[PDB]
Design brief:
alpha/beta; nine-stranded mixed sheet; monomer; D-Maltodextrin-Binding Protein, domain 2; transport; 9 strands; binds fe (iii) ion; metal-binding; 311 residues; binds zinc ion
């Protein structure tokens, strides 16, 4: 009665997705095979595989890889119920994909090293000479590259490249946002630019990587207050189209969004009238900038960051 199920190219954090798959397979009997990787490499893989891909669904941490795959005309339109399930602000103006979760940019900092009042007012302030040697990031990741794509959209190419060149002077690189957080936790550096969920995830475990940190929210519709939207799409090449649609409907529906609210991943729910974990600052209180996800440009970001010597 059930076949072998679907193949999901999964670029979202494995433990978030495991909470979804467990519930989904229990509910529907549809088996899920995860093939994990980062947003960029999985997006490029889909483009290069094209119609020969075994992928039924693509999930991402951020929006730019969704835009890349949609630009290649590789997605199927999402079923009507799926489109109605997600709040308008978390659906692209153009493109055959949907938001599935969201995350807030933050400045993670160590209060034993540096004090709320001392934090940068704007992410743009991190370019100033007084910030030299005082902040970290993980430039190779799709997470940080998405924050740069928002800056590109909000401030334009000239101002973004300028900030990136100053970043080269000022920042210290670590591989992975968890690594950035741990570095701040250990007092290696005053702070860093990451997403909000890392601290919550660790605090729900042992807290050994996060107890000496706190989170700062830039607010003010600052580029640093960017809320990155995680994406899901069904591949047009899918040989399991209904099961694929069922999966994206499920994760964006009441069951999937309830799991975001209650699991130990601590990412924001994007469903219509879907509340998030009560430990989180509500989305409506973040004072985030308006950034159209379908305008975000991963290729241009890589070009600018490469020009700045960051990649
Ligand atoms: Fe991440
Ligand atoms: Zn990889
Ligand atoms: Zn300091
Ligand atoms: Zn603060
Ligand atoms: Zn203001
Ligand atoms: Zn099937």
């Amino acid at each position: 009665s059930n076949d072998s199920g679907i193949v999901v190219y999964n670029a979202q954090h494995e433990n978030l997705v495991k909470s979804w798959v467990d519930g989904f397979t229990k509910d529907t009997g549809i088996k899920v095979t995860l093939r994990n990787g980062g947003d960029s490499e999985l997006g490029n893989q889909l483009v290069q595989e094209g119609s020969a891909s075994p992928a039924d669904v693509f999930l991402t941490e951020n929006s730019p890889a969704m835009v890349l795959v949609d630009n290649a005309k590789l997605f199927a339109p999402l079923d009507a119920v799926t489109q109605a399930q997600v709040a308008q602000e978390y659906r692209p103006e153009h493109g055959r994909w949907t938001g599935i979760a969201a995350r807030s940019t933050v400045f993670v900092y160590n209060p034993e090293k540096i004090s709320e009042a001392e934090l940068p007012k704007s992410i743009m302030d991190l370019a100033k000479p007084e910030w030299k040697g005082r902040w970290a990031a993980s430039p190779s990741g799709a997470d940080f590259q998405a924050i740069v794509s928002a800056m590109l959209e909000l401030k334009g190419e000239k101002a973004t490249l300028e900030w990136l060149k100053a970043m080269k002077t000022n920042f210290t690189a670590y591989k992975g946002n968890s690594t950035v957080m741990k570095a701040v936790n250990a007092g290696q550096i005053d702070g860093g630019v990451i997403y909000h969920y890392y601290r919550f995830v660790d605090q729900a475990k042992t807290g050994e990587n996060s107890g000496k940190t706190q989170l700062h929210y830039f607010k003010h519709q600052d580029p640093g207050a960017f809320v990155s939207i995680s994406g899901g799409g069904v591949l047009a090449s899918s040989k399991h189209p209904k099961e694929a649609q069922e999966f994206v409907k499920w994760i964006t529906g009441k069951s999937g969004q309830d799991i975001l609210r209650t699991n130990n991943a601590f990412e924001y729910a994007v469903g219509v009238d879907a509340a998030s974990n009560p430990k989180l600052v509500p989305l409506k209180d973040l004072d985030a900038p308006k950034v159209e996800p379908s305008k975000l440009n991963s290729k241009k970001v890589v070009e600018l960051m490469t020009e700045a010597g960051l990649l």
